[PDB]
């Protein structure tokens, strides 16, 4: 159908809103019928035929435009359809659009609002909104010109305009709709799912069944999006109506009369929309100060005596109580303006009694007046009123309408009649003269008849029975109210029914002006309309004592604040039913924070006043406690009412009004604020002692303690005991306080105070409004104090913006409380720049960081300034003098620092006290954040080493959900950046929703904060003192999450964990045996830290200049570098094994080593002649000690010259070939430095000079010479000569290649190619399999260059010399000059000073490429010097150890650290390198070293042989045994190397990587894991035959026996004889293994196997990767086998993921399967499915130890054919 063209079933507008859906009715109305569809979806919907058209054009006017609309021909719905309608639009203000639709010919009813008056002016300019009117069918659309977004759209449905039916539908930009009342929505946000709400004032209980209540409010707010952009709509119409929400999203107003008079209000935030609305309808009244106290009331006190007893009881309990209410009891025969002469005799005396105790009296007054006035018994109110003719009349307009209420037959005053107001005033005056009351409570002002219409009933008119009736209760407009044809001054009851309460409140406000002189009073009303808040407060009606009503109280209160009636609350402890102690207690707790706080009970229920529950009840104690807190904060509350009254702010506020940037705050309705500063979190559930609460993104302080909470922008479970409610102060605000008393009268004479809650930038602001609190128009007559407080830079400024009032009580501020500060000291108070004599006494709690400045008196009404200076603790002290020499008080005062000789060790003597840089221009983007940093203190910065940089930029980038980068650099000048490429995402994916972190840039001092979203833990905090960015001195510090830090190397440490007791460690490559506090071969600026909850993160600083790190016990970490920029990468975790996978993804994953390189290796410096290496080979085979690689040191080279062959090793080439034929492999050593003193042809140097590959001076062009190993030709070398003498007499001059350069790369590769294939003689060709590149620091035996010496000392001995070795010899010690020049690939020139630590890294990749070219296979590189991203192409060995006992444990620590650094192939020299090995030590070391990934026995020259065959038979047996274990496990070990290469897993893992929950594992460094499954527990001590090992919580099987040991989380003593190493397998894992042999070549041709360790559940899992083990890129080119295996339900299944290597032509045989933990029951049978072939294997089950051994060698089963193995246990 074409008329029925509706895009979306959700955009259907119901055409039958009255009766049930029937095709008969729809066909009659002309609406399309479509019953197919979902629930609540309307089958009947209007067609395009319905509506109006604009005939002509938009005639313009002075205020806007006018348009004539005629009715599109269509069937009438309810009849009397107006045909000609006029539209008038008025651009009243830049943010307020008004339009009105009315009849063109006839005049209709319009609301006579007292405040809103007709607009006389011209159109405003410029406007923030655009109005576009569609001509056919007619529609109006308001558009936000700023972002071109439609806010109001009336096109979704037709305009309907009949006499007794008007309709308009509006499409909305979002579903965030708040407002529309008065009903119980049970939630602040509005459910847009086909819900309809009636609006018609009515006396009924707030049951919660969606019924019309006592008031009529048509305003709603809509929040467009997270920018804060918002708008509001208000309809000025007093007729009965209903509002229909639709999941379009869309709202629709359906009314029974009047005109459509709309206002659209725009604002940048929700609060601005509310302010716009309240400025239009009228600003709220300022209440008297006493009305903010607590109020007590009860329906039936029966007698005055009972009332008096309640008063006395509560007074005696000392409960904060100020106002006592009186219900209709006092009134005799419930008649107004009268009191009971007997039961309530003495009522006047009660009023006086209250006043003498500083308490108040509020009396109730009803609108209905009785008619029983006879000459015998006169009733004055009635007689005087009848004389004035001020009653509501019957339709005849003359006869008073008679209704029935409390007094019985009654008449109703017409408050819209001016004469009525005069009568009303007089009545109050006479009664006030009898009883001296203080305020008025008006009730049943809906109006409310106990009968329907009148005592005579209602006429049959279209007013009493209209054609359309909203979904009102009962269904009759005259039910429990007056007849709709009754006549008043403003019109008929049909039009003014919703205005009765409004009109009465106006009249009462007038009466008060006369009765009470210059004394604003209090009018509490029930019935309300828009604009009532200017005159009265409101209470939410007759609730019941249930847990639902408790919950519903909060959204009700929040909506009324929108409507401009801030003085509002519900009845505490319920009005109907009986309350329980818990409900009344939990209600008194939250009720203490209602704007209007009153306990009100009904008739015939248990007394519920707090003192009723007993003088020492928990309820009374709790009530007294929180009511005292309310009284302390009344100055703060009163000022909030001032801002509502003056500007239109809310008092009790929803979270979304402050924290709209987040979407988690757009639904909260169980938590609220007082103004912007105080968050209230109640318990609203029966029996609960915990709440789920959302904490928004701010600093929050616990009100009761003052301590900061750690929660931010997250949900929490809060522990709230029966007598506690959640209260928190927001940082950045100042709160005025006043010492509390039992009444407001006694409290306003007590001293004042301030609470200062500081924020992230250590700043706060506040206001105090002060006045008499009783007089009227104080603000209008400008008779009041207004203060403005502000804190910044440890200075408070009080400042009086208006002072025309003087307080008679001589009040003073006596205390100042500061939250989130360091200890304040030297407090100076001055008034108007005039010193005030005072002795401020400060008291600081160190843990909560809370201070109380007392002994001060700030006279209210005068300007002042209080300044303080702060004390720094000894743990937060940052060294201001890290220079090598010059430490003195004179040198500190100059730098601008403080000097204190701390007796405590470690604590610095000269510390920092001020900041050098300021922050500005902070901008947060979707995928980043930036800021400008500018030097403030030029002089002090200059005193610090080097020249200061002035302008800096901070850039933060959100690369991924778990990774981010932040960088600080000079935007004006290029400074050196490390040329090591990293792998970052090209397009940022740090989407706000997915990302694991948040960033915050702070000020005073400057700093960056990074926080983990899930737990709210801060993982990086830089707001410490010391940030410096000089040219050659950059410093920055961070606060560590916990005391656990692992990483930073390469430097020997006593442990895996780092000691943070004032320790400084340098980093700059040097040829120095690893030692304590000694810079070594590699520089890795990376750490991983554990948070206290066991979450983990990692941080990389990408910098290559010389540097150091200091560990303060704050915990704090400081970095100091000698150049470059600051470039940080952070990995968010969340587990210790995912930070390594994240790190290696960024730097590059480890290299895959050749299978043969996992065998055992032999090396020895001092090989005399070739025939010796031959002898070793033969002897090794004889004793059957398995080995795979034989190394050759500089001995094979002539005079230690590279690319030469010594005459002593003439047969070497032949030997290499013979060994290789038997499956052995050979690695050769190469040094980088090339000799320049050769007399005979030396191609390397000659061609190097021609290709210019050597490092030369900046411009001079001379080669920087040095002295390493190469010797001089034609001299005799005497070993006796001291080393110093040899370096000076025998060592030659050498040149160092620049490996960054393209020419150098070509020369180097060609030289290695000629080494493999000798061009001069093929007989001299050396067929190597890998390369060992050593002395690549670079390293020299002469500091700087050869003598004369170096040139530029500025670089050699820099301004700041990091804490390295020989700290007085400078950077050039044992290395090149720092001025040497190098050339990057792109041609740019750099200094050795910047790239020194990247020299080994620069050589590594070229070497790797050439080896893979000459050999045609994978190859292996081993490098001494390493830098982040070196593990991508090479392994590393832990350098020159010594044969000593402490060196065994140091090796374990070293290999765990290099795994974190992403270098998986690593190991130490077995049996030591220096000194001579000892039998026991060399034996114990052989056992340990059998489990290093790089397992090599290496010794120095002139030392006892350490080779397995250099000892006796006892050793040969120990060595052979352990090495056979190694060769057995190689398939498992090789699979581990594969996963690391492909996923970034670790091979030698720590225990905390697998068991992070056990905190015992956080300090273990004497045991380790290979992969997840294999635990190694060595003996590391002399003469020890037992080892104490900790077994984490799991199933641990002994490797040798296969028996499970019961040690789950316990220590145990393991037997460890000299010939044994303790090994254990973790249950739940499957290990592939293979039979051992002399070399891998032979072993790869034997049977495979699978040890299966079942867990407690009886499940196990494992992997196998298999390839050739030699070819390049086997995985990238897809020639490999990869499979995952699983064991469960007594069966094992193989899941080949990829197979292109294992075939029938190339089989991998499987022969043995051992299952551990199968249980004690005998095993009936075992079956193997070989590609559809069942095989019965040989088997044996020893139920003593529970191990099934399955043999299948005869089965001839290849792995590719295996599918599954099943075993059935005996029933
Ligand atoms: C309810 O409170 C009473 C009285 O407590 C005192 O007053 C409070 C307002 C607060 O200032 C407390 O620190 C005071 O102790 C508790 O009862 C005992 O009352 C006697 C006499 O006043 C007092 O000396 C004791 O110290 C109080 N007992 C204690 C502290 O154990 C009473 O325990 C509270 N109610 C409940 C249910 O615990
Ligand atoms: C108060 O109003 C009621 C209702 O109008 C009056 O009661 C009626 O009085 C008339 C005589 O005037 C009787 O014929 C009716 O039977 C009464 N109606 C009832 C009882 O429903 C009453 O007289 C008024 N009292 C006055 C004016 O003093
Ligand atoms: C408190 O301090 C303020 C700021 O110094 C004073 O306010 C100024 O008063 C002068 C009086 O001639 C006015 O011209 C200025 O407009 C005011 N504001 C500013 C910003 O200068 C105020 O007088 C002081 N109040 C005292 C001394 O009680
Ligand atoms: C090769 O080197 C070996 C070892 O240096 C030489 O012979 C032995 O040297 C050791 C001392 O290193 C002595 O203890 C032995 O007595 C030597 N043996 C002999 C038979 O002299 C050997 O001479 C060298 N020459 C070659 C192999 O040409
Ligand atoms: C290595 O140097 C030492 C020390 O200079 C030489 O030893 C001396 O040789 C002379 C030869 O005439 C003897 O008179 C001395 O007694 C030796 N000792 C000392 C302490 O002077 C040694 O000869 C050199 N070795 C060589 C050249 O092979
Ligand atoms: C191999 O040499 C080792 C080291 O000298 C011998 O070990 C010692 O043997 C004695 C006598 O049995 C024991 O008292 C010592 O405790 C052993 N020391 C160590 C460190 O174990 C060993 O006996 C020799 N083996 C052979 C077969 O001679
Ligand atoms: C493990 O070894 C330790 C250290 O040798 C043994 O403890 C000592 O045993 C001797 C036996 O004569 C006692 O004299 C010492 O007092 C013991 N020292 C300590 C610190 O206890 C221990 O008995 C061995 N325990 C085993 C194998 O379970
Ligand atoms: C063995 O490998 C297969 C294939 O990679 C794994 O199965 C997949 O598992 C993922 C993650 O649970 C699922 O999304 C896929 O649907 C699975 N693919 C299939 C069944 O073809 C399997 O989980 C691995 N087994 C073990 C124990 O890791
Ligand atoms: C696995 O099964 C095979 C076949 O039954 C066993 O090998 C045979 O062992 C017997 C006894 O030593 C010899 O007579 C045969 O010559 C062996 N055959 C071969 C081909 O070597 C083997 O011992 C079993 N393995 C285990 C650990 O039980
Ligand atoms: C070494 O092992 C062999 C083979 O088991 C054995 O015969 C010999 O006695 C062992 N030697 C020692 C000293 O234990």
UniProtKB/TrEMBL annotation:
Q: Which family does it belong to?
A: Belongs to the glycosyl hydrolase 31 family.
Q: What is its main location?
A: membrane
| Annotated keywords | Cell membrane, Disulfide bond, Glycoprotein, Glycosidase, Hydrolase, Membrane, Multifunctional enzyme, Repeat, Signal-anchor, Sulfation, Transmembrane, Transmembrane helix
**Record-linked PROSITE patterns:** GLYCOSYL_HYDROL_F31_1 (PS00129), P_TREFOIL_1 (PS00025), P_TREFOIL_2 (PS51448)
Q: Name one GO cellular component term.
A: endomembrane system
| Keyword Membrane attributed | yes
P-type domain residues are 2-48, 868-914
Molecular-function annotations in GO: alpha-1,4-glucosidase activity; carbohydrate binding
This protein's species is: Sus scrofa (Pig)
A Pfam family recorded for this sequence: Trefoil
GO terms (BP aspect): dextrin catabolic process; maltose catabolic process
Name by which UniProt lists this protein: Maltase-glucoamylase
Membrane protein topology class: Single-pass type II membrane protein
